[PDB]
Amino acid sequence: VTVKDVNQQEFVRALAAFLKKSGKLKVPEWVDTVKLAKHKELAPYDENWFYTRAASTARHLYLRGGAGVGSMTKIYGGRQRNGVMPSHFSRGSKSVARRVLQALEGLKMVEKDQDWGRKLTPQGQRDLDRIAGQVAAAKKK
Template sequence: MDNKRVKQGVTVKDVSAADFIASYASFLKRTGNVELPSWVDYVKTSTRNELAPYDPDWFYVRMAALARQIYTRPGRGVGAFRKVYGGRKRRGSKPSHFALASSSIIRHALRQLEKLEVVEKTEQGGRRLTRKGRQELDLQAQRILSGQ
């Protein structure tokens, strides 16, 4: 028997989050189906940030992270994702406060995932994976475990 046999029924939950997000982001970039917005090079991801992200592929990473979040907890909307990607706003000598992430970036990334038929809107609001999306994400997780 071959020792490199892939475990049947591999899901995204069987793979570490960092490995999956990096792999799926590179997959999204390779396919070329994602339309990057014109502002992707200079936009900040939150009002709490001073600068735009250093990684030129940050939008693909955000899309992959959103897809994984929807896989693990379906039904979340833009408002919930603003809290997830928000963080501490430094205010100088004043105490820090929590600041939400940009909703425009999250909304645009979710629209791109909808265009790729990975995510769809629910009746109650929020998003969930489509059948095609679940298969695509599980296939990506299987590729990670098999070492391809």
């Protein structure tokens, strides 16, 4: 199936687990000291947040035409509570997303293609739709 058919809350939670089994993703050392965005006030509860976020990275590339380190951050950014000052939007971290996308590219599930952005490899696109049916196999769509 196409990844469109299935729920997406389910998609990531099986795709994150998939990667961590296969020895995939060489992770940065900083992963236990990282706020993760400028608009947070705390570190994540999750201890495998890197695996989770790489799932959501590869999915969006399937849909849209692909874009760099800047655009990924804009997709993830949220609201910043400035305390006594009124809240405003802001963008999160960059150097995390710059490690994510290069780690994917090491596995050749993405690659720097033309028109100013990484795009997902046919090998990558194969692997997405492969586990997309595994979701329907599991529960029952």
